[PDB]
Design a protein around this nucleic acid. Structure first.
Ligand SMILES: [Mg+2]
Ligand SMILES: [Mg+2]
Ligand SMILES: [Mg+2]
Ligand SMILES: [Mg+2]
Ligand SMILES: [Mg+2]
Ligand SMILES: [Mg+2]
Ligand SMILES: [Mg+2]
Ligand SMILES: [Mg+2]
Ligand SMILES: [Mg+2]
Ligand SMILES: [Mg+2]
Ligand SMILES: [Mg+2]
Ligand SMILES: [Mg+2]
Ligand SMILES: [Mg+2]
Ligand SMILES: [Mg+2]
Ligand SMILES: [Mg+2]
Ligand SMILES: [Mg+2]
Ligand SMILES: [Mg+2]
Ligand SMILES: [Mg+2]
Ligand SMILES: [Mg+2]
Ligand SMILES: [Mg+2]
Ligand SMILES: [Mg+2]
Lengths: 141, 63, 80, 67, 55, 143, 206, 70, 60, 145
RNA sequence: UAAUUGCGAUAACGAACGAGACCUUAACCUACUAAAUAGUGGUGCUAGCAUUUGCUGGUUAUCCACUUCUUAGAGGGACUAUCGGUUUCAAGCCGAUGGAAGUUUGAGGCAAUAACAGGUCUGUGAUGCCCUUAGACGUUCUGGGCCGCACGCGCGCUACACUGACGGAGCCAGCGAGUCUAACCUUGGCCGAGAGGUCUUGGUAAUCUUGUGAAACUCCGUCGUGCUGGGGAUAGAGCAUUGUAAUUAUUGCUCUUCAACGAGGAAUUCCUAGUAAGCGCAAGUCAUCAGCUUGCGUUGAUUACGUCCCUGCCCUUUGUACACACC
């Protein structure tokens, strides 16, 4: 084949997966391009990495991403992560290191976790309340 | 309206039988060379700055 | 034809809970001082190479009001 | 609160008591040492232990430690 | 029967609504005994010979 | 360059295809439209009155373009929204099986979808065509 | 800024302002400074952001919630009173709208007005119910800077929503309006009235 | 029924001449000049775009925003 | 995993403690190509009190 | 949509179906202030009558008005379902009526009394001032009648 | 210290039960073993648009390959690490750095000795004693009743709207569960506005329902502050589903009727991070019925990170004529 790597990004249940092949600078998510996405208020969340590290950067690669699970926001943070980690995976193998450290350094400076996936997760409700911490309601008498 | 800037130094402890109140010593940096102890309402760490509204009256304990 | 039964005199009954439970049953039911019964069982168990053993008797015995005893020797752990 | 229990502290003592030539303010090697030199059932207790024998060790370099 | 039922006055919301409510509606739990829970009523007691042969 | 429909955002594609089929005439729009409701989890009929059949038709079309095969059941569940059961909690409920299945026929008798094997309905060869066609029409508005 | 285009193409003002300055929805982040001393540190601005939605972790350690971008600290607190718990996208939009309105009126970096509105409403001293034996009097207290920002936010948003309740003007207009009058406190604002009256009673026990 | 649900030739002309000086114009702003209920107000915002002084900064439902033309 | 969630109490008294049990089902399959002999030689033995072995065949 | 002009053509308030209707409110909704005409029914009828739903009750040519009154009291001929209607399959001639305006008052009374005259339990329960449809009357509805 | 958790002090030294360890789940592995019941790239065969190569799909085996994502085996990993402040430089504690992770890592499971006349003889073919035992307190069968309505109390649900209702349109989860001597979960096609009907069909299940296209939510419209289109109680009339039976209306749909409620006195509950709150879903129950429960995921805050003022308990000291122990 050609130069190409696969990476991912996860935020809660959602798991966004990237295939970053060598190519002519596209970036499509699930099936459509990246200049659509929606939530769209959020839109700039996922444009972000490409700005962070300069819009060029991608003209030697094509990027595909497919999100599954998690809700409308869960996915948009998940995807942007897999995009940035996908850049850094490529320059890990196919470019030099000092570029890969150049990239990682400007992601880690701005960062919404972006390279690292966030540990946060729903805590188990326990019997006695509608929630995890939440208790019910007592009245004594 | 003579405002008075004072740099907090050394967190000395909580007062008020409630507990909300905290005792600190300050340092106006509009000429240091002098220091004073105040009561804060909110959360405080060393190197904060308090708008003392009366440069000349300090408070001790709370019940 | 499609099923079969087998007897298998288990290896040392002294470390079978069930064996000793049914023992104490058939002890007291055969008329035996409660202390004698239990303390007996704990002695056969311990002697049978146990690390430790424990016996509770709850219930009402000759008196009207219900009491309950413990009867433990040696080592036990209780958690996890 | 990460106050280390006695079994952690006790085992740690005896390990330094008789294996100071060996062990060295690196949790990693003191870990592997413990596998060889000591019997422990769980991985966590093993770390928890080595982690403290490495503590004790790391400050003995600066004076004695009572016990 | 049903003919009796609607013909019958003394019945239906109108009336009840214009009747005073007893004060026992608003009574508490009555409780009766709990401050006596620990002193046996049997008046009998066991003994110590029957207890000691027992245990 | 070339184009898909994926190249085009949701709203702009459908208000285009809706505008198409009204501009068109070749429809089949049952006739109980305007007197009908679109779900039992709804309160008022569609406000687009004269139209909105073209809205669903276009919506339906684009959806079945996007995937393998999908039928009345799926489409009913998709278009279904929350229903206030009055003083009782909201529950999702499926929407009208007629509206859709008849949009599925009207769009078929017009040749955009074909009763696919495996199941349901799947984008016709000729829809691929026309859908990628007005899609570019929607991009050429911003050229 | 020198153009760049690859396959799937990226819009002009999008390409433009982005790789340049790290500015907001599209708003200048430089300039923008904290008119009252202290109050810096405990008001963000730089690091700069695109929109004020983030997977922050400001809560699991004590003071670090200061390190949240203040503008997001506005929208965060925008989302409440029961119904609107969560609904951050809702908030976000309102703020974007809001800034636009604030900006439209009287020029000025809108987030800079948010800077001037907030700085202007944090009460410099207050009171707590000291024991004093039953009839609990009122000891004045020079209050923390952090609490001074918090209170500012809480105040601003609240009396904005209160006005915004039951009437035509959208929550954004009133949020804008509050900040506007709060820019240099003009006594016609919920927060200033409530600020000063907290200082009214703070001074009135000394 | 407290006024502002219709057109009134005087109101039309009110809209034409009374809308400079609105540093901010919007649904709400239109009702606040003691006139137009929110519905016809929204219709006006549209037909002041047709060729009328207002400059369309920012977008949509609930929120509208315009300034004077330049 | 097969949960069963229950109040502990036989009756109704007391704070409403709940308690859930579970039974873990572990299934697994392995495909082989081997003549009649090895198959049956592999089915009769390799038996175990605890493991439900099942050997289906066929291209359908 | 349209910056409209309109001369004096429109009257605020207007009386039809023996009731009163405010003009400066949208006609779909305006029409609902007749007894027995819910929002849906209002809607379909105007949709039927070739009347503009964007209009107020105000404008509406006098011809257009009368048309509405026509359709409203004859739904079966002017092609409106049957399941769209309040009183279908009567209980005498079993026709499909859409009882309108000051009539629905009397028709509730008619039914209500039909039960009582028949001594049926739902009847009795009505006369006893309670709720019929089988809800618990212990805890709920208290202030009341 | 969360802890008789330790440090220290020290006529004590050194130990065990309990706490801890442990075990379960949620987190991290491009390391290891694999997978047509999970999935990726390439190639076939093939549709659309562009055509200069492109872009977006179709194709349970037309093949070759791989295991990043999914699955679950075995290992690994964290030990509050490195450094630095703080402190009897003790246990520790606080901050920064690194880290999947640094609140017992998060949440549970388990849990010593004791006490209570706590609750359960209405789960038990567990049981003593009492009562009854053929005009039965056994048992079945027919019908009503536990729902009965001047009212007092408690858990809830829906709301009082414009951070909204409605209407189009975008379109996104995770725990589950499903039919043999049977009628369970149901895709698809028709018919019906609807509720539903009818024909077929896959699934004893990572293989089918199901990507459970769930809901808040996001978009563009309509309405405009008017008890309004907020709200949907009460009620009439009709159509359907479960069931042998629906009247005192099991549930469902349609039209209509359109109440109180304009943020709630004194009081009082719950809660510290993926928590609160909002939001729906599956499972229990279940012929039929969820405004309940048990879990689950979605959206995602504000404010503490303190204290002993209130309440609750714990430990000492102290008093005692109490030991059936202040009932
Ligand atoms: Mg334990
Ligand atoms: Mg919808
Ligand atoms: Mg939906
Ligand atoms: Mg709600
Ligand atoms: Mg009406
Ligand atoms: Mg132990
Ligand atoms: Mg793997
Ligand atoms: Mg860090
Ligand atoms: Mg008792
Ligand atoms: Mg029992
Ligand atoms: Mg019995
Ligand atoms: Mg009952
Ligand atoms: Mg309760
Ligand atoms: Mg909506
Ligand atoms: Mg029909
Ligand atoms: Mg079959
Ligand atoms: Mg109304
Ligand atoms: Mg409503
Ligand atoms: Mg159920
Ligand atoms: Mg129940
Ligand atoms: Mg004594």
């Amino acid at each position: 084949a050609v130069p190409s790597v696969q990476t991912f990004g996860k935020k809660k249940s959602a798991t966004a997966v990237a295939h970053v092949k060598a190519g002519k600078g596209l970036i499509k998510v699930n099936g459509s391009p990246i200049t659509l996405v929606e939530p769209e208020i959020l839109r700039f969340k996922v444009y972000e990495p490409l700005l962070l590290v300069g819009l060029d950067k991608f003209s030697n690669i094509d990027i595909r991403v497919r999100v599954t699970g998690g809700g409308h926001v869960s996915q948009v943070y998940a995807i942007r992560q897999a995009i940035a980690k996908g850049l850094v995976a490529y320059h890990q193998k196919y470019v030099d290191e000092q570029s890969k450290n150049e990239l990682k350094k400007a992601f880690t400076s701005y960062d919404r976790t972006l390279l690292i996936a966030d540990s946060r997760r729903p805590e188990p409700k326990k019997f006695g309340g509608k929630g995890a911490r939440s208790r019910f309601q007592k009245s004594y008498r | 309206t003579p405002v008075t800037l004072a740099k907090v130094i050394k967190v000395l402890g909580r007062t008020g039988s409630r507990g909300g109140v905290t005792q600190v010593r300050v340092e106006f940096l509009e000429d240091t060379s002098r220091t004073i102890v105040r009561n804060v309402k909110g959360p405080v760490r060393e190197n904060d700055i308090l708008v003392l509204m009366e440069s000349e009256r300090e408070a001790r304990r709370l019940r | 034809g499609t099923i079969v039964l087998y007897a298998e005199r288990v290896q040392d009954r002294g470390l079978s809970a069930v064996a000793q439970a049914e023992s104490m049953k058939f002890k007291l039911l055969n008329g035996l001082a409660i202390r004698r019964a239990a303390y007996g069982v704990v002695r056969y168990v311990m002697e049978s190479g146990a690390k430790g053993c424990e016996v509770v008797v709850s219930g009402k015995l000759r008196a009207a009001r219900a009491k309950a005893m413990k009867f433990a020797d040696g080592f036990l752990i209780h958690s996890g | 609160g990460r106050v280390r229990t006695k079994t952690v502290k006790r085992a740690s003592k005896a390990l330094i008591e008789r294996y100071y030539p060996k062990l060295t303010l690196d949790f990693q090697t003191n870990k592997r040492l413990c596998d060889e030199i000591a019997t422990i059932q769980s991985k966590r207790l093993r770390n928890k232990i080595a982690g403290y024998t490495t503590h004790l060790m790391k400050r003995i370099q600066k004076g004695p430690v009572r016990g | 029967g049903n003919e009796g039922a609607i013909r019958d006055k003394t019945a239906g919301r109108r009336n009840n609504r214009s009747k005073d409510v007893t004060d026992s509606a608003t009574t508490k739990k009555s409780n009766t005994r709990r401050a006596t829970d620990r002193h046996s009523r049997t008046g009998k007691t066991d003994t110590k010979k029957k207890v000691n042969q027992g245990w | 360059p070339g184009v898909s429909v994926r190249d085009v955002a949701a709203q702009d594609f459908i208000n285009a295809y809706a505008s198409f089929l009204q501009r068109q005439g070749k429809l089949e729009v049952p006739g109980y439209v305007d007197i009908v409701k679109t779900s039992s989890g709804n309160e008022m009929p569609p406000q687009d009155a004269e139209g909105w059949f073209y809205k669903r038709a276009a919506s339906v079309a684009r959806h079945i373009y996007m995937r393998k095969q999908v039928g009345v059941g799926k489409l009913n569940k998709l278009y279904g929204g929350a229903k206030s059961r009055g003083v009782r909690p909201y529950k999702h409920i499926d929407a009208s099986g007629s509206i859709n299945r008849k949009v599925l026929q009207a769009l078929e008798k017009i040749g955009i979808v074909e009763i696919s094997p495996k199941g349901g309905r799947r984008i016709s060869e000729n829809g691929q065509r026309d859908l990628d066609r007005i899609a570019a029409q929607t991009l050429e508005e911003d050229e | 800024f020198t153009p760049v285009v690859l396959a799937t193409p990226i819009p002009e003002e999008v390409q433009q302002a982005q790789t340049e300055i790290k500015l907001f929805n599209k708003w200048s982040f430089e300039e923008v400074e904290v008119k009252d001393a202290s109050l810096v540190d405990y008001v963000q601005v730089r690091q700069p952001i695109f929109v004020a939605h983030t997977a922050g972790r400001y809560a699991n350690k004590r003071f670090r919630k200061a390190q949240c971008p203040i503008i997001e600290r506005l929208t965060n607190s925008l989302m409440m009173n029961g119904r609107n718990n969560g609904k951050k996208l809702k908030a976000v939009r309102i703020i974007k709208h809001t800034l636009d309105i604030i900006n439209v009126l009287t020029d000025q970096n809108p987030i800079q007005v948010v800077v001037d509105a907030i700085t202007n409403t944090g009460p410099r001293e207050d009171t707590t119910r000291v024991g004093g034996g039953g009839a609990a009097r009122r000891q004045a207290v020079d209050v923390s800077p952090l609490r001074r920002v918090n209170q500012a936010i809480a105040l601003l948003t609240i009396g904005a929503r209160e006005a915004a309740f039951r009437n035509i003007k959208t929550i954004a207009e009133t949020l804008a309006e509050e900040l506007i009058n709060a820019a240099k406190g003009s006594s016609t604002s919920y927060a200033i009235k409530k600020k000063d009256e907290l200082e009214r009673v703070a001074k009135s026990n000394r | 029924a407290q006024h502002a649900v219709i057109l009134d030739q005087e109101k039309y002309d009110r809209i034409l001449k009374e809308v400079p000086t609105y540093r901010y114009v919007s649904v709400s702003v239109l009702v606040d000049r003691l006139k137009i209920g929110g519905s016809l107000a929204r219709i006006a915002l549209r037909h002041l775009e047709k060729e009328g002084i207002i400059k369309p900064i920012s977008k949509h439902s609930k929120q509208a925003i315009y300034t004077r033309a330049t | 995993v097969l949960k069963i969630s229950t109040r502990k109490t036989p009756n109704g008294e007391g704070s409403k403690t709940w308690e859930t049990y579970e039974m873990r089902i572990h299934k697994r399959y392995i495909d082989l190509e081997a003549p009649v002999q090895i198959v049956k030689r592999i089915t009769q033995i390799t038996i175990e009190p605890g493991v439900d072995v099942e050997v289906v065949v066929a291209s359908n | 949509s349209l910056v409209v002009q309109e001369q004096g053509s429109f009257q605020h308030i207007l009386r039809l179906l023996n009731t009163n209707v405010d003009g400066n409110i949208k006609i779909v909704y305006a029409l609902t202030t007749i007894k027995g005409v819910g929002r849906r029914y209002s809607n379909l009828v105007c949709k039927k009558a070739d009347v503009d739903l964007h209009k107020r009750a105000g404008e509406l040519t006098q011809e257009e008005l009368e048309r509405i009154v026509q359709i409203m009291q004859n739904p079966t001929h002017y092609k409106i379902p049957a399941w769209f209607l309040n009183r279908q399959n009567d209980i005498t001639d079993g026709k499909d009526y859409h009882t309108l305006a000051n009539n629905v008052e009397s028709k509730l009374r008619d039914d209500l009394e039909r039960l009582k005259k028949i001594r049926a339990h739902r009847g009795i329960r009505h006369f006893w001032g309670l709720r019929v449809r089988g809800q618990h009357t212990k805890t709920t509805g208290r202030r009341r009648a």
